[PDB]
Write a protein that binds this ligand. Structure first.
Ligand SMILES: [Mg+2]
Ligand SMILES: [Mg+2]
Ligand SMILES: [Mg+2]
Ligand SMILES: [Mg+2]
Ligand SMILES: [Mg+2]
Ligand SMILES: [Mg+2]
Ligand SMILES: [Mg+2]
Ligand SMILES: [Mg+2]
Ligand SMILES: [Mg+2]
Ligand SMILES: [Mg+2]
Ligand SMILES: [Mg+2]
Ligand SMILES: [Mg+2]
Ligand SMILES: [Mg+2]
Ligand SMILES: [Mg+2]
Ligand SMILES: [Mg+2]
Ligand SMILES: [Mg+2]
Ligand SMILES: [Mg+2]
Ligand SMILES: [Mg+2]
Ligand SMILES: [Mg+2]
Ligand SMILES: [Mg+2]
Ligand SMILES: [Mg+2]
Ligand SMILES: [Mg+2]
Ligand SMILES: [Mg+2]
Ligand SMILES: [Mg+2]
Ligand SMILES: [Mg+2]
Ligand SMILES: [Mg+2]
Ligand SMILES: [Mg+2]
Ligand SMILES: [Mg+2]
Ligand SMILES: [Mg+2]
Ligand SMILES: [Mg+2]
Lengths: 206, 226, 155
RNA sequence: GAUGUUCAAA
RNA sequence: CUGCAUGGCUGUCGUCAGCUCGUGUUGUGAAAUGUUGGGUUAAGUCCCGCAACGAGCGCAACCCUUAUCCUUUGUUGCCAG
RNA sequence: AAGGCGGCCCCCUGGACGAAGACUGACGCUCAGGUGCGAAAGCGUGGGGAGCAAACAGGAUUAGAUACCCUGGUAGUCCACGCCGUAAACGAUGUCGACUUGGAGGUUGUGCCGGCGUGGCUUCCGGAGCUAACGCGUUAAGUCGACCGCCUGGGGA
RNA sequence: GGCGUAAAGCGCACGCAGGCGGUUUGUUAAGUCAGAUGUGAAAUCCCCGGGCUCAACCUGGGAACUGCAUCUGAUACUGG
């Protein structure tokens, strides 16, 4: 059948909102459009930076961008020359003063976004897809995943007919609301066809 | 333990001749009113040596398991095993109780946790709801595994009150190379039981005689060790 | 001091509504030498998981074999499920002459000189079971002596 | 309780 | 332009009650068993039996709303005094 | 013996089995060729012909319907006497002999004191064993001996 | 090596030739077995050597060719 977004169903119950601000209808849509411009801008030139989550807060004075990159080294560079330039551009987007906050991804193989993006890059590089998914699952297990599930679907391996492969280790209880599920979706633009990679990561309840 | 003792209890009785087993021909004397009669002369002499063997097992501080899933000897086996400080199985013989020790041990550990928490442990966080579930689970795990809860290992010798009723138990014992002492009947088969004991299991006062007999041997041997 | 050999590996399948569910089986033989030899069959999703389970079962089901020096006591014929294996004692230094599945069982068993030919079905699981049956069939001169109450007149 | 033919290969 | 190259999304049976696994046992084996059967339940829900013993995903629960009480606040809502 | 054999009565006739003894004295077992018997359909000649029913005809059905369904209907089915020599003629299991745990029947004798014993035939379940498995299992496909028939990839055949 | 179902029990029976044959004693010694003797050419083969520088090659001796025939003996079984 059809499965509801794991983040969406429990967003009020457990998951934090990427945008955590208050607006009225006068600028509600404007803020959302600005957020979109910030996000799509950041992802395109920070693709090698292993950026995971873009959390934006909006005080009536500035724009606070908490970025959950796995490598701070690249996103900040030396003495923060890349981050000052980043502030000057992101500030211009929302036309307000800009605050950049950098978060540390200590456990990357435990993040649904990072693993999915790595699997998509392997598919683009032609790494056989049966091996990459298994390797990601093993890495997540050796570093403390209660449950894991990876679903690579599309024209797998240049196949004429699209196929759906999923592999689950451990325990993934989507129906239990108090459960916490780190879910993300990346897309692989392989030459033969678009390939969708889904990842579920279960890391305990409450 | 003699000729007169067993005949008085009426343990010489057997199943209808139509439900007999051909491998019981040595331990059968005759038929009366289409009912087989175990020959006391064949059993009693070789009954004592099996009881001596139980003493030889008890002398090495062995663990004797007594299995009586039969209603007739249900309370009989429990009291007989507990009187000698040994372990027993009574509610029902779960398959894999001996062969699948790892999975049974897991359930025994949960049973012990439920017991140490339901009574000694704090009843706080009862929520009035899960209290009746956990206690019922404890009763289920007590009837099934309570007898072997403090065994913490695999039985050195096995005692069975009816070979055909506990065929699964005897099969698990044979796989683990555990000596089996079973009170076989005209209907049962003696292929699996290492020390075959002919005798009726249907009578209440009959089984208590056999259970009292083996109980005295282990007590006699623990005292000899002391 | 325990010798482990993998006789054969195969991919089996169980059809379901979705399609094939591939699985792997491993036939392994465990022998410490001196005539103690066991075989185990294991099944798992992966070949390494399958071999370990097979080794575990084999260690549990090892059986003893009467052996004269490094050769068989007497000529032996063992048949399992249509697979007829034949074995016979050979001279010192003749080595092992047998089919690869059969050769594996004998080397780990502790047999060094033997001439073995396999008839009927050549399926590895059946032939190793027939070899194990035959090795058990073999009898020591002392066992024959005790059976017939003879004081080792034959040797 | 009427009738309902067929379907190259990968 | 081709949903018959795809992704994402969605309809459907259907909220249907199912889908499996670890170990044990069985069978030469593919496999089976549990998951069957007697009831029962909204339900593989639960129980008894039973070579099975447990476990997971689904079911349920957790989340939201309403039905009743208690406490806190009292404005912009309330009025017994 | 197999193919087979059902109202009753009579006539002629074959086999089987049980019981207790007399008698012969290995007279046996199996059998290539050979010979006899052998469902149904068919064939020959003479009958007989109610029903059924190939063929054939008409009606329907259907895209078509040389079929299935309907309404009819000849051979044939029946008899006598020949011929044919074939069947999934099957237990898909050649015949004779011995041995090898049991349990519930059916059916026909037969002794004993309501039961018990003892034979013949026959059905079901099932142990060991055997089997690739299904299964067979004292009526074996178990363990053996005697002799005969047959097989040796699928088609062609 | 097989023949219930993979290929494979004649449709069934009778029966001649043929094959096989319960049990005991005597006799024969046909089969059978033992001993002896003759033969089984050489080459080959195999073994232990020798000579070609080695090797192939060549060669000395032995083993083998246990097959056949006769003579003599045994008689447990089979046969008469
Ligand atoms: Mg929905
Ligand atoms: Mg073959
Ligand atoms: Mg489509
Ligand atoms: Mg379409
Ligand atoms: Mg439901
Ligand atoms: Mg097995
Ligand atoms: Mg299993
Ligand atoms: Mg099942
Ligand atoms: Mg099911
Ligand atoms: Mg089933
Ligand atoms: Mg049920
Ligand atoms: Mg459940
Ligand atoms: Mg159940
Ligand atoms: Mg005949
Ligand atoms: Mg003939
Ligand atoms: Mg006719
Ligand atoms: Mg005519
Ligand atoms: Mg008509
Ligand atoms: Mg008609
Ligand atoms: Mg024919
Ligand atoms: Mg035939
Ligand atoms: Mg017979
Ligand atoms: Mg049967
Ligand atoms: Mg039988
Ligand atoms: Mg063959
Ligand atoms: Mg056939
Ligand atoms: Mg026949
Ligand atoms: Mg004779
Ligand atoms: Mg002679
Ligand atoms: Mg010569």
């Amino acid at each position: 059948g059809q499965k509801v977004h794991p983040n969406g169903i429990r967003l009020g119950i457990v998951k934090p909102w990427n945008s955590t601000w208050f607006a009225n209808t006068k600028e509600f849509a404007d803020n959302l459009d600005s957020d979109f411009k910030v996000r799509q801008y950041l992802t395109k030139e920070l693709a090698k930076a292993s950026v995971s989550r873009i959390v934006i807060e909006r005080p009536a004075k500035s724009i606070r961008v908490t970025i959950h990159t796995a490598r701070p080294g690249i996103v900040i560079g030396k003495k923060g020359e890349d981050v000052e330039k980043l502030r000057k551009v992101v500030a211009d987007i929302a036309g307000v003063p800009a605050q950049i906050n950098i978060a540390e991804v200590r456990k990357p193989e435990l993040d649904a976004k990072l693993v999915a993006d790595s699997i998509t890059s392997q598919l683009e590089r032609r790494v056989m897809f049966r091996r990459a998914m298994k390797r990601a699952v093993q890495n997540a297990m050796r570093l403390g995943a209660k449950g894991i599930k990876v679903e690579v679907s599309g024209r797998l391996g240049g196949a004429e007919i699209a196929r759906t492969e999923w592999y689950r280790e451990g325990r993934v209880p989507l129906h239990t609301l108090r459960a916490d599920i780190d879910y993300n979706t990346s897309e692989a633009h392989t030459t033969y066809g678009v390939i969708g990679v889904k990842v579920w990561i279960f890391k305990g309840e409450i | 333990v003699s000729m007169r003792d067993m005949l008085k209890a009426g343990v010489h009785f057997g199943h209808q001749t139509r439900y007999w087993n051909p491998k019981m021909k040595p331990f059968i004397f005759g038929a009366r009113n289409k009912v087989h009669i175990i020959n006391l002369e064949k059993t009693v002499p070789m009954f004592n040596e099996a009881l001596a063997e139980l003493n030889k097992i008890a002398s090495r501080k062995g663990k004797i398991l007594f299995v009586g899933t039969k209603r007739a000897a249900s309370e009989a086996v429990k009291d007989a095993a507990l009187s000698c400080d040994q372990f027993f199985v009574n509610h029902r013989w779960l398959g894999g109780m001996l062969t699948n020790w790892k999975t049974v041990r897991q359930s025994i550990k949960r049973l012990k946790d439920l017991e140490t928490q339901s009574q000694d442990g704090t009843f706080e966080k009862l929520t009035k709801k899960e209290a009746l579930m956990r206690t019922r689970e404890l009763e289920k795990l007590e009837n099934s595994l309570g007898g072997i809860k403090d065994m913490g290992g695999l039985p050195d010798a096995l005692f069975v009150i009816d070979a055909d009723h506990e065929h699964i138990a005897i099969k698990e014992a044979n796989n683990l190379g555990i000596p089996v002492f079973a009170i076989v009947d005209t209907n049962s088969d003696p292929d699996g039981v290492d020390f075959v004991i002919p005798g009726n299991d249907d009578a209440i006062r009959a089984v208590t005689l056999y259970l009292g007999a083996v109980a005295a041997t282990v007590r006699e041997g623990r005292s000899q060790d002391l | 001091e325990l010798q482990e050999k993998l006789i054969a590996v195969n991919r089996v399948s169980k059809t379901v509504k979705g399609g094939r569910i591939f699985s792997f089986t491993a036939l392994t033989v465990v022998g410490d030498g001196n005539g103690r030899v066991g075989f185990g069959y294991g099944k798992a999703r992966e070949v390494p998981a399958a071999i370990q389970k097979a080794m575990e079962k084999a260690r549990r089901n090892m059986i003893n074999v009467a052996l004269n020096n490094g050769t068989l006591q007497h000529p032996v014929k063992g048949v399992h499920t249509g697979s007829r294996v034949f074995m016979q004692p050979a001279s010192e230094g003749t080595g092992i002459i047998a089919g690869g599945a059969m050769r594996a069982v004998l080397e780990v068993a502790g047999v060094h000189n033997v001439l073995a030919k396999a008839y009927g079905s050549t399926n590895p699981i059946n032939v190793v079971r027939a070899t194990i049956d035959g090795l058990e069939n073999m009898n020591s001169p002392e066992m024959v002596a005790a059976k017939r109450g003879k004081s080792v007149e034959e040797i």
